[PDB]
Write a protein that binds this ligand. Structure first.
Ligand SMILES: CCCCCCCCCCCCCCCCCC(=O)OC[C@H](COP(=O)([O-])OCC(O)COP(=O)([O-])OC[C@@H](COC(=O)CCCCCCCCCCCCCCCCC)OC(=O)CCCCCCCCCCCCCCCCC)OC(=O)CCCCCCCCCCCCCCCCC
Ligand SMILES: CCCCCCCCCCCCCCCCCC(=O)OC[C@H](COP(=O)([O-])OCC(O)COP(=O)([O-])OC[C@@H](COC(=O)CCCCCCCCCCCCCCCCC)OC(=O)CCCCCCCCCCCCCCCCC)OC(=O)CCCCCCCCCCCCCCCCC
Ligand SMILES: CCCCCCCCCCCCCCCCCC(=O)OC[C@H](COP(=O)([O-])OCC(O)COP(=O)([O-])OC[C@@H](COC(=O)CCCCCCCCCCCCCCCCC)OC(=O)CCCCCCCCCCCCCCCCC)OC(=O)CCCCCCCCCCCCCCCCC
Ligand SMILES: CCCCCCCCCCCCCCCCCC(=O)OC[C@H](COP(=O)([O-])OCC[N+](C)(C)C)OC(=O)CCCCCCCCCCCCCCCCC
Ligand SMILES: CCCCCCCCCCCCCCCCCC(=O)OC[C@H](COP(=O)([O-])OCC[N+](C)(C)C)OC(=O)CCCCCCCCCCCCCCCCC
Ligand code: HEC
Ligand code: HEM
Ligand code: HEM
Ligand code: HEM
Ligand code: HEM
Lengths: 51, 364, 85, 64, 241, 70, 364, 49
């Protein structure tokens, strides 16, 4: 019963694909001081600024 | 044996036309079931092509898919109107004494609220998306599991096609459980009979055959109610809706005002009048649980009569609920109305449905 | 249970019973192995005999169908091997 | 290479375990000469089904 | 009817045994170097290869290709190196294009191929190592048709895809035609059923647990039946002359 | 047989649900969920070890390193 | 009152392990309901996304979506196997005397056949599409209103996305009606009780309490049959299927052989063995209607016992049905099997279930 | 538009525009004149544009 409940519930967890786009990493050693760079992440464009 | 059909069940002569509200509610349940089954046979649940197939395929390619959709919307609205009148009548005539009928009714009310919410979600418009977002954010306040549970419910960090598919399946399933609970509702009522205008213990010589007199009365009242209902399906088809739901949902853009359907506003008010999220959730659960009559269980309790004071306070309850809904939606631009919203909510939370004989006793 | 069709039947048909004595042992005083091998043997033999009886017509008809099946199968093999299809 | 062994095994199996099928397919080859719209697809399919029952597993055991 | 594929002993058709994963690696090599331009794997993504390949190897393999990106700020189309989450590259733009590059034939998608053919893995093996046989009498073969006795009808539009020493395996195993056929069949078995080992393992666990439950419940049923299996009856006699 | 042991065992564990329920939970965990399940898992992993995915990945990294040195 | 729980229902002591087939069928109904609800929460019905969303989303994006799908498939197959064993036992023990139970069971059987067919239609593969086409070609043979009828069934001249969506709604809806019919089945049985190995009229002293002995036996038999079931789920997942359903549907290409699932094959045989399409339709309808017991109604009919000749003939019926299924599949290539197909079908149609006491009478 | 216009006028209006067609023999892309059953032409390729 325990494993069956856990398994039926696990059918409702996030899909592996959604777990692949959730985390991304950017290289901050490329942007110089005072420059803002735009990237893509989960559709919403993201600004990285060297404040 | 036609005679045996007439005498199968008998009731009191004091059934005013106000006792057809259950029949009207059943009519609108039937209309909802049929129109929803017709809609679901043309529906695809997915963020890509949900809003499109409602507005471009169902409405504009079928002969009267528009009429089906309008029937469904206004049937939900009128089902809630009739249920509210039904509850108000049952409170007026002290029908809390029909314990089993009342408890099944409250369960059915909760189910129908859930059905309405999950249905409104399926139109992947701006209002649907952001109502889901707000409700699920209220889910996030539970101690020690708000984020795990929220992720499980949504299937991710964001509403998506899997969320739409879950909602579609739940919306399809729940109304059938609702039909079963309606059957149980009527079974209990037949077991304990009806109250009428006044309560009397009548022998068989003072009761009348249910059929066909009350069936014909039900037909008459249902005909009038359907006239009133069709005056809205054909001439005010979006009076109960919000125009922002005719905009395809943008997860990046939030609407100016997020207002639920008019039959959920009271609940929304409870959320807005309680600054603490956990306290708001607790108050919501306690409210829904206190509408029932599950305690005391083994202590001896019985119900006495109802009086003019209680009926006047019932009118006050109605007033407070309506004002609370309106104010809850107004407070987004006008901060001074918080006083009146809180006052109305407080007045609602302290309304006596059952006068407890335990108010009077002595001390050891 | 008292308002059931089989209870109504037993009340209509059977008399008011009298003179019946029943003895029951609690399962904690009964050995699960007590009558095991004897019952296994007896039931196996009974089922062997009974299936030998009621299975004979099916066996005969299955034999006839097997004859027909073999005939048709080899006829169709001969048809396919000679391009007579 | 394993391909040469495969061909050798196919020849052996054809001539030692499907000799009757080989004779039959040779017989049917003569029959269709001249006839219009006739082919030996079925007979050759039977032959190559019979041959691979014995030839194919052996080769399958010689490869990693 | 066509030839019935022989039944061969595959390592994953064995007791308590699963995919080889060495055959799967080598079959991935053969897929990359042979039938990537002709056939498609619509259901396989680069991150799926992180089962017999290392994370960095998968990352480099993904970056080796180009994928469509969101349109430019002016609406212009773009290309972008692939990532883990992107589906492998399609070989053709649309079916017509495919049919034009294969002389009217359309190479099917091989994502579930072993599940889509009768006697799947064997069939595929029997299909690939069956191309050089003599053509039967009375059969007219076009310039783009070949005789394969295992294909439906005996005539196929796929040129013999495998030749000896065509691919240089990384682990040094010789790449003969039967070897490469075995490796691609194992790889396609993995593609069709990427859950082989987990399925077998769950099967063993579930059967064991149900067996425990069955033994215990059978004992308890036999115990409870003891009350009735030993019941005794006695009838008080009548008074008869 | 084992009259004294039977009495002791019954009086200790089986007489009360306050102890029988913990006993059955212990049996569930230590003798079903980490004894049959995990044991079959380990056995499966051990039999099929020369063909393991881990083994394949390790050999692959080794060969890649060896090729990179040329 | 635990005692009152024990004695609420009593049965005979002659319930051999063969009387747990109803419980096994209940287990498989539960499995199908749960698996189907989980699948539907991830399913989109259309000709552009259906096949893809099963093989690329359900079976590869979730942790064990493949396991859920295999459960659904093999649970359908085993439900049919267990139901056939249930029916065979009912015929063997002359359980047609339980008139209410038998009629409800036949209704449930027809409903389950419909559910299985509509579900198989949802995998928009080659076999699904072409089985729909063949069955609808059976439909269009109705005199007068056939062609129009077909259009109404398909919503067009071909199978399309709307067809898949309505099929999905039907497949979702029907199993719940099946649940209600199972409840009625059990209610009628508890009204008339179980036959057992032999029929006796027992007083309360000869009967035993149902709870918990028969529940424990049901658990034991259910665990054994679940072992057998799971052997197929994990090691023979595709044995009860045709590989051509893993090829996405191609309306321009017909498969070499169109064959339905093993549990519908007998019906298919009844169509292959009757050359005239209208006659085949009529004979299928008469077959289904004749399995029931709805005639005579107001003529006095009662049931006698069953004997060894009847049991042997029942075994013969099983043999004939199996042979008919195999031959109706085999006739596509080999035309000499029509003899044995027709012979087996005629033998099936001439099997006596109820021994007509009216066989013997005298003329005026 | 055949609700306040005539069939011929709507046909000419539809034919006045160019609508994407199914690819040709060699793949690629084709465009064909509009017809009654075609949707009205979009003004932009994609949201960014
Ligand atoms: C070969 C043997 C086949 C089985 C057989 O002969 O059963 C009848 C035969 C005796 O027949 P019976 O006493 O006349 O009762 C017949 C009733 O139908 C059953 O009487 P019951 O109420 O005592 O039933 C107990 C129940 C529970 O099972 C047991 O009692 C098993 C034995 C005791 C528990 C220890 C072993 C547990 C193994 C379970 C299976 C694991 C997988 O056993 C059964 O239900 C019998 C087998 C059922 C499966 C086969 C038929 C399925 C038909 C389906 C439709 C077609 O044996 C048993 O019933 C088993 C108990 C007696 C043997 C000694 C057991 C202890 C020592 C050995 C361990
Ligand atoms: C998948 C699942 C497959 C089926 C597995 C279950 C199964 O085989 O059950 C049969 C199997 C047969 O029972 P058994 O093995 O002969 O006896 C086990 C217990 O001694 C049975 O103890 P019990 O029957 O006394 O039940 C314990 C307790 C029910 O359990 C609790 O109250 C426990 C929770 C207490 C706190 C929350 C409330 O009962 C009550 O609360 C009612 C007693 C007072 C009645 C009014 C005077 O277990 C049950 O039937 C369990 C009880 C089911 C509910 C009715 C009582
Ligand atoms: C020696 C020691 C043996 C073990 C001791 C033992 O048996 O203990 C009894 C103990 C339980 O006995 P019990 O207390 O009388 O209870 C057993 C039954 O509940 C009640 O059993 P029953 O005596 O009431 O009989 C079951 C009855 C009532 O029916 C049922 O119980 C249901 C099953 C009926 C048969 C199967 C019908 C299946 C229909 C659907 C099929 C769908 C297929 C789908 C395939 C799809 C493929 C893609 O059905 C039949 O008797 C008819 C079946 C006859 C089978 C034998 C036919 C032989 C002739 C063959 C002729 C040639 C054919 C062509 C070649 O254990 C067993 O019975 C275990 C099974 C033993 C079977 C062999 C017996 C010896 C022979
Ligand atoms: C029918 C059998 C269903 C078994 C499901 C087992 C797994 C499970 O419960 O997962 C939790 C998941 C949780 O997700 P969900 O499917 O309830 O829906 C998520 C989206 N909401 C709730 C916002 C609509 O599934 C269920 O809970 C399914 C049962 C729902 C019961 C009624 C909920 C009403 C909500 C208004
Ligand atoms: C033996 C009973 C007949 C079925 C044969 C297959 C089978 O048992 O599969 C179950 C599987 C065995 O199948 P398997 O997973 O080893 O693979 C099939 C292997 N061949 C093709 C050689 C038969 O599991 C077990 O039998 C192990 C016991 C489970 C409980 C511990
Ligand atoms: C030259 C391009 C090309 C290459 C390289 C190629 N194929 Fe094919 N393949 C085709 C075409 C074209 C078809 C379609 C055959 C038909 O339908 O007649 C096909 C058909 C198939 C089929 C379908 C057989 C059936 O029964 O329908 C399979 C399986 C297959 N190929 C596997 C492979 C494998 C494995 C490889 C790598 C060894 C491979 N192919 C290499 C072009 C190619
Ligand atoms: C099984 C019966 C039902 C089915 C299959 C069903 C199905 C659907 C479907 C597919 C939609 C989306 C299409 C659309 O939005 O127009 C929908 C919307 C909706 N349903 Fe239902 N429904 C059912 C019963 C009910 C019931 C009983 C209610 C209760 C009032 C209800 C309330 C709603 C609401 C409020 C909406 C959204 C209204 C809107 O479109 O703006 N449905 N339903
Ligand atoms: C689906 C919505 C509902 C339907 C279809 C429904 C239907 C009915 C019907 C047919 C009756 C008997 C006829 C009548 O007296 O009007 C009835 C009576 C009653 N219902 Fe409902 N009902 C619903 C919701 C509720 C709710 C939410 C409650 C609140 C607890 C409720 C409480 C009662 C009571 C107390 C009675 C008996 C009143 C009396 O005779 O004194 N019902 N209902
Ligand atoms: C409300 C309950 C049920 C729901 C919601 C449901 C839903 C679904 C869905 C969405 C599919 C398509 C996904 C897939 O093919 O894997 C499906 C397939 C299927 N269902 Fe159900 N189902 C239910 C009950 C049943 C029942 C009772 C049966 C009969 C035993 C059944 C038999 C099938 C079959 C045979 C298939 C196709 C098998 C295959 O994919 O090859 N379903 N069902
Ligand atoms: C979903 C499929 C079905 C389920 C779940 C089901 C369930 C049950 C259950 C639980 C019982 C009582 C336990 C037993 O005696 O085995 C039963 C008895 C019975 N069922 Fe069904 N049943 C199904 C299909 C059928 C069908 C198709 C028929 C054929 C008309 C049928 C005829 C009977 C009869 C005659 C009995 C009583 C036998 C007797 O005690 O003499 N059932 N069923």
């Amino acid at each position: 019963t325990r494993v069956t409940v856990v398994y039926l519930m696990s059918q409702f967890m996030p899909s592996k694909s959604s777990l692949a786009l959730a985390n991304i990493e950017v290289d901050i050693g490329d942007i110089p001081e005072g420059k803002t760079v735009t990237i893509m992440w989960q559709g919403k464009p993201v600004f990285l600024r060297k404040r | 044996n036609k005679i045996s059909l007439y005498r199968s069940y008998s009731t009191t002569i004091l059934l005013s036309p106000a006792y057809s509200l259950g029949f009207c509610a059943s009519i609108f349940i039937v209309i909802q079931i049929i129109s929803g089954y017709i809609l679901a046979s043309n529906y695809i649940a997915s963020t890509n092509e949900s809003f499109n197939i409602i507005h471009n395929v169902i409405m504009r390619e079928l002969d009267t898919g528009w009429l089906i959709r309008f029937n469904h919307i206004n049937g939900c609205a009128f089902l809630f109107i009739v249920i509210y009148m039904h509850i108000y009548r049952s409170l007026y005539h002290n029908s809390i004494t029909k314990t089993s009928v009342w408890i099944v009714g409250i369960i059915m009310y909760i189910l129908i609220c859930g059905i309405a919410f999950t249905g409104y979600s399926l139109v992947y418009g701006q209002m649907s998306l952001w109502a889901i977002v707000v409700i699920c954010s209220l889910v996030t306040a539970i101690p020690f599991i708000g984020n795990k549970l929220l992720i499980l419910i949504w299937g991710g960090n964001i509403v998506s096609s899997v969320t739409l598919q879950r909602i579609f399946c739940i919306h399809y399933l729940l109304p059938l459980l609702l039909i079963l609970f309606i059957i149980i509702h009527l079974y209990n009522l037949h077991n304990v009979n009806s109250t009428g205008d006044n309560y009397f213990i009548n022998n068989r010589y003072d009761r009348i055959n249910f059929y066909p007199l009350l069936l014909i009365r039900d037909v008459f009242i249902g005909s009038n109610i359907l006239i009133i209902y069709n005056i809205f399906v054909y001439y005010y088809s979006d009076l109960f809706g919000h125009p922002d739901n005719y905009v395809p949902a943008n997860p990046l853009v939030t609407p100016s005002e997020i207002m639920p359907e008019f039959y959920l506003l009271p609940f929304y008010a409870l959320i807005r009048a309680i600054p603490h999220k956990v306290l708001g959730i607790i108050i919501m659960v306690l409210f829904l649980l206190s509408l029932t009559n599950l305690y005391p269980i083994y202590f001896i309790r019985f119900y006495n009569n109802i009086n003019i004071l209680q009926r006047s306070l019932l009118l006050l309850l109605l007033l407070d609920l309506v004002i609370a809904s309106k104010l809850c939606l107004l407070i987004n631009h006008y901060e001074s109305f918080y006083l009146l919203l809180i006052l109305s909510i407080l007045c609602v939370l302290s309304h006596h449905i059952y006068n407890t004989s335990f108010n009077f006793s002595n001390s050891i | 249970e008292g308002h059931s069709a089989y209870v109504a039947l037993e009340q209509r048909v059977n008399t008011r019973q009298k003179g019946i004595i029943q003895r029951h042992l609690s399962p904690y005083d009964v050995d699960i192995r007590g009558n095991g091998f004897r019952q296994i043997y007896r039931l196996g033999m009974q089922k062997i005999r009974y299936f030998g009886l009621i299975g004979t017509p099916c066996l005969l008809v299955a034999g006839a169908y097997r004859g027909i099946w073999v005939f048709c199968e080899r006829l169709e093999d001969e048809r396919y091997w000679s391009n007579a299809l | 290479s394993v391909s040469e062994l495969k061909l050798k095994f196919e020849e052996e199996c054809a001539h030692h375990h499907c000799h009757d099928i080989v004779k039959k397919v040779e017989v049917c080859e003569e029959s269709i000469k001249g006839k219009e719209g006739k082919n030996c697809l079925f007979q050759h399919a039977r032959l190559w089904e019979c041959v691979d029952h014995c030839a194919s597993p052996k080769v399958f055991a010689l490869l990693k | 009817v066509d030839s019935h594929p022989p039944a061969l002993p595959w390592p994953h058709f064995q007791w308590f045994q699963g995919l080889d994963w060495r055959s799967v690696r080598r079959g991935k090599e053969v897929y990359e170097q042979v039938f990537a331009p002709c056939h498609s794997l619509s259901f396989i993504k680069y991150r799926h290869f992180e089962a017999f390949m290392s994370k960095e190897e998968v990352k480099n393999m993904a970056a080796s290709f180009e994928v469509d990106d969101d349109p430019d700020e002016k609406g212009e189309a773009r290309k972008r190196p692939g990532k883990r989450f992107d589906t492998v590259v399609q070989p053709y733009k649309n079916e017509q294009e495919a049919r034009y590059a294969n002389n009217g034939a359309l190479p099917p998608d091989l994502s579930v191929i072993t599940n889509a053919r009768h006697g799947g893995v064997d069939y595929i093996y029997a299909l690939l190592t069956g191309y050089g046989r003599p053509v039967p009498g009375g059969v007219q073969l076009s310039t783009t048709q070949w005789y394969n006795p295992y294909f439906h009808g005996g005539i196929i539009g796929m040129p013999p895809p495998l030749t000896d020493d065509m691919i240089e395996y990384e682990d040094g195993t010789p790449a003969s035609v039967p070897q490469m056929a075995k490796d691609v069949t194992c790889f396609l078995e993995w593609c069709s059923n990427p859950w082989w080992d987990e399925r077998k393992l769950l099967g063993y666990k579930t059967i064991a647990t149900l067996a425990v439950i069955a033994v215990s419940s059978g004992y308890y049923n036999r115990f409870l039946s003891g009350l009735w299996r030993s019941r005794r009856l006695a009838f008080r006699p009548f008074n008869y002359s | 047989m084992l009259a004294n042991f039977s009495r002791f065992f019954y009086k200790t564990f089986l007489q009360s649900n306050a102890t029988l329920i913990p006993l059955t939970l212990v049996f569930t965990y230590x003798x079903x969920x980490x004894x049959x399940x995990x044991x079959x898992x380990x056995x499966x992993x051990x039999x099929x070890x020369x063909x393991x995915x881990x083994x394949x990945x390790x050999x692959x990294x080794x060969x890649x390193x060896x090729x990179x040195x040329x």
